[PDB]
Amino acid sequence: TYIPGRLDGKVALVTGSGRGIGAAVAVHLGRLGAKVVVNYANSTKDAEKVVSEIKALGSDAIAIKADIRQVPEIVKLFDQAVAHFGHLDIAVSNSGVVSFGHLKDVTEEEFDRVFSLNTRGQFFVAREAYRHLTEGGRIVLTSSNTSKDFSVPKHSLYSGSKGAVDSFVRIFSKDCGDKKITVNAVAPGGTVTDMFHEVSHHYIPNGTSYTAEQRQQMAAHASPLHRNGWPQDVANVVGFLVSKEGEWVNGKVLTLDGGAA
Amino acid sequence: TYIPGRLDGKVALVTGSGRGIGAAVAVHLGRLGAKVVVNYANSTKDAEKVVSEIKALGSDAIAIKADIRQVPEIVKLFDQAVAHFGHLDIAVSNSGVVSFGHLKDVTEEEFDRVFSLNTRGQFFVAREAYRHLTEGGRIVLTSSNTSKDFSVPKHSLYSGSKGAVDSFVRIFSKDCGDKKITVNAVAPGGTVTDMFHEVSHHYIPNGTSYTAEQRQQMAAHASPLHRNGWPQDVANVVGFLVSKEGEWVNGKVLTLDGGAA
Numbered sequence: 001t002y003i004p005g006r007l008d009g010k011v012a013l014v015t016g017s018g019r020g021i022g023a024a025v026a027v028h029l030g031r032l033g034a035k036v037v038v039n040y041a042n043s044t045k046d047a048e049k050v051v052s053e054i055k056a057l058g059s060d061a062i063a064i065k066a067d068i069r070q071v072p073e074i075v076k077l078f079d080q081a082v083a084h085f086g087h088l089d090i091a092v093s094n095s096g097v098v099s100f101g102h103l104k105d106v107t108e109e110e111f112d113r114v115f116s117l118n119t120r121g122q123f124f125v126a127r128e129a130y131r132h133l134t135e136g137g138r139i140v141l142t143s144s145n146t147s148k149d150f151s152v153p154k155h156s157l158y159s160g161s162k163g164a165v166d167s168f169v170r171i172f173s174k175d176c177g178d179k180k181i182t183v184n185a186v187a188p189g190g191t192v193t194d195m196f197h198e199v200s201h202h203y204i205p206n207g208t209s210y211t212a213e214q215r216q217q218m219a220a221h222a223s224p225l226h227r228n229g230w231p232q233d234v235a236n237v238v239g240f241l242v243s244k245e246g247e248w249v250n251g252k253v254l255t256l257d258g259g260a261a
Numbered sequence: 262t263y264i265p266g267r268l269d270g271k272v273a274l275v276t277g278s279g280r281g282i283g284a285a286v287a288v289h290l291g292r293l294g295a296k297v298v299v300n301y302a303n304s305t306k307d308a309e310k311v312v313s314e315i316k317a318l319g320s321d322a323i324a325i326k327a328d329i330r331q332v333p334e335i336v337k338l339f340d341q342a343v344a345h346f347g348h349l350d351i352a353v354s355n356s357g358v359v360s361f362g363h364l365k366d367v368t369e370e371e372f373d374r375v376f377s378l379n380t381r382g383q384f385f386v387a388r389e390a391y392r393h394l395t396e397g398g399r400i401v402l403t404s405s406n407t408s409k410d411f412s413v414p415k416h417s418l419y420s421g422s423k424g425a426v427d428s429f430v431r432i433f434s435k436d437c438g439d440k441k442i443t444v445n446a447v448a449p450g451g452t453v454t455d456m457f458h459e460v461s462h463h464y465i466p467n468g469t470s471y472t473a474e475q476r477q478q479m480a481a482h483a484s485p486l487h488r489n490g491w492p493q494d495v496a497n498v499v500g501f502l503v504s505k506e507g508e509w510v511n512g513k514v515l516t517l518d519g520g521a522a
């Protein structure tokens with residue numbers, strides 16, 4: 001009785017896994033048999049619930065605080081992971097922030113706020129993952145449908161931040177091959193989280209004239225499956241990418257929008 | 262009387278047009294009838310020769326020093342352009358630096374060196390272009406075949422800096438449409454300049470024992486036309502994009518590699 005995609009004996013790290021997509025990814029990898037490093041920057045209590053949830057399904061996990069904007073903290077995060085669990089096999093770079101603004105109004109401060117986490121942060125999470133990971137490991141970064149597949153006015157900064165990631169993973173796969181580590185990205189479409197409700201009004205003309213429920217309902221019709229994307233959808237795909245069965249998917253960006261594009 | 266393809270009565274600015282691709286673009290736009298702002302960071306003499314060349318073919322030009330890494334100098338550059346010529350119609354963002362290195366070895370310093378110019382710099386050149394341009398104007402940024410079309414080991418940092426640019430211009434076209442300004446990028450393949458010779462050993466099978474000239478000869482075979490790309494090849498395409506007749510190409514990235522991909 002073959003059960004595919006188990007991660008028994010494996011150790012995974014997920015950045016920003018206290019809440020949102022990261023949280024569901026972390027719990028799912030735990031459910032699949034992996035021990036999990038739950039990284040957070042702010043959401044201490046949320047991260048501890050995630051740790052508790054993973055332990056409850058019969059795995060093990062630890063919540064570690066690190067600001068992914070700070071490269072020395074990324075280094076420390078990965079050293080702590082290895083010192084605690086003994087090895088690290090899977091690294092999922094998930095932390096990101098969203099941004100909207102007409103090009104004409106984008107400040108230096110906002111450019112840097114976004115790129116420092118979404119692009120620079122993810123680049124050095126991948127570097128540190130390469131440095132710490134066991135042979136035959138897995139690195140997954142997080143892009144967006146807005147990188148290439150979906151054009152939203154006033155969304156250039158954020159779209160660009162993930163466009164860089166798409167290019168990163170393709171070349172990362174070449175470099176990381178010398179340790180047989182695969183490197184991919186997931187590019188979610190609208191996925192129901194704190195970030196989604198924060199900006200749902202942009203995926204519609206005007207959009208501020210609807211309730212959060214109406215906007216969510218309207219977003220559900222983007223997919224021909226007529227439902228919203230959920231953190232579990234992303235987790236399902238990350239789970240496969242980081243499994244043994246996922247190996248021949250390498251250097252690729254998978255847009256996870258339920259067929260919207 | 263308007264002449265099709267020409268740029269008579271227009272004012273153009275090219276970043277880093279003292280040498281390399283920028284210089285060819287700047288001279289070509291001058292040849293097409295545009296008055297030209299020739300930006301440089303270091304190459305004073307080269308920039309002045311560019312200015313003289315544009316004057317020799319019956320147009321006008323001024324060289325203006327500005328470090329494109331510095332957003333306040335971009336502002337200054339565009340301010341001076343508008344003060345000097347009365348208006349600015351065309352902005353070409355060309356300045357860039359190359360980088361190679363395995364992911365594992367990439368430093369904070371190198372990441373920032375590359376992104377501050379290639380990505381952040383170009384983003385803010387686009388912001389200042391929008392801010393200063395006449396209605397119906399043109400903005401072109403510079404990407405690379407390595408963004409999406411060509412994978413080179415140890416080239417993740419630079420490849421990603423241009424992948425951001427690809428996504429930027431697609432969305433910039435939406436924002437800038439409210440002034441009828443088109444925004445595109447050119448994505449050169451290997452193009453014979455100082456930059457090409459620094460890195461051409463990465464582009465060919467095993468070119469270790471080969472001097473610059475031999476590496477260039479070998480790289481000439483990537484294109485099914487069996488020649489190298491030249492700065493004039495890029496200038497030729499820029500000249501069309503920034504013309505009236507180029508209007509319906511908007512929000513796009515054109516890979517200019519003579520058919521190699």
Ligand SMILES: NC(=O)c1ccc[n+]([C@@H]2O[C@H](COP(=O)([O-])OP(=O)(O)OC[C@H]3O[C@@H](n4cnc5c(N)ncnc54)[C@H](OP(=O)(O)O)[C@@H]3O)[C@@H](O)[C@H]2O)c1
Pocket residue numbers: 015016017018019020021022040041042043044066067068069094095096097098117142143144145187188189190191192193194195196
């Ligand atoms: N949800 C969508 O519709 C959507 C669509 C496309 C792409 N994405 C991408 O999917 C990823 C997750 O999005 P989400 O919807 O789950 O976002 P979210 O609900 O806003 O959650 C953000 C996550 O990022 C973490 N984080 C923020 N700043 C951090 C920092 N400096 N260092 C470390 N972690 C930090 C947060 O942890 P703390 O609370 O501890 O700060 C939190 O866990 C992001 O990369 C996002 O760009 C989301």
Ligand SMILES: NC(=O)c1ccc[n+]([C@@H]2O[C@H](COP(=O)([O-])OP(=O)(O)OC[C@H]3O[C@@H](n4cnc5c(N)ncnc54)[C@H](OP(=O)(O)O)[C@@H]3O)[C@@H](O)[C@H]2O)c1
Pocket residue numbers: 276277278279280281282283301302303304305327328329330355356357358359378403404405406448449450451452453454455456457
């Ligand atoms: N050549 C290729 O094979 C190739 C391939 C793909 C993409 N590209 C892209 O095409 C563009 C031009 O490349 P190229 O081959 O002409 O490069 P190059 O020969 O190295 O020339 C670089 C140009 O950028 C300018 N520059 C450098 N730093 C600057 C700064 N801080 N501020 C303002 N300007 C600065 C330089 O001016 P100063 O001398 O005054 O510093 C110079 O004019 C770049 O964006 C490059 O990434 C080139």
